[PDB]
């Protein structure tokens, strides 16, 4: 019986805006 | 019986806005 | 036996002009 | 037996001008 | 047995002019 | 019964903006 | 922004 | 923003 | 931004 395992992302910070 | 998992996400930002 | 499941998934952003701009998913 | 699985993904990001912008996925 | 498996991704980025971009993606 | 992992992400920063 | 605590998955423990 | 708290799965304990 | 705290899987502990 084996494991694995996946991973973690943070994203901290201000999508995209426009300029159009 | 082997486990497994997935990832926990996080995101702490404004999503996008328009400019048009 | 034994198995593990996807993984969280977002998605974000959006701006400017537009057109054909839209996700899909297909899962575990 | 046994098996780990996938991670996770994100999508941000905009802007400017536009057209066929987006996604399409299919997890583990 | 036993196996590990995926990793994460991030997409980010955009402006000037645009078409044609944007993702795709398929996991473990 | 082996193991393995995955790889965290993290990005701390604001997403793309425009000028156009 | 701001703090944060603990993340991380776990195992067999 | 502002402060959190844990997270993370757990496993088997 | 800010502060953070632990991360990382974990294994067969």
Same mark, same amino acid.
């Given at each position: =019986?084996? #494991?694995? @395992? +996946? +991973?973690?992302?943070?994203?901290?910070?201000? @999508?995209? #805006? =426009? =300029?159009?």
């Amino acid at each position: =019986g084996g #494991q694995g @395992a +996946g +991973g973690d992302v943070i994203e901290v910070g201000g @999508a995209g #805006q =426009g =300029g159009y």
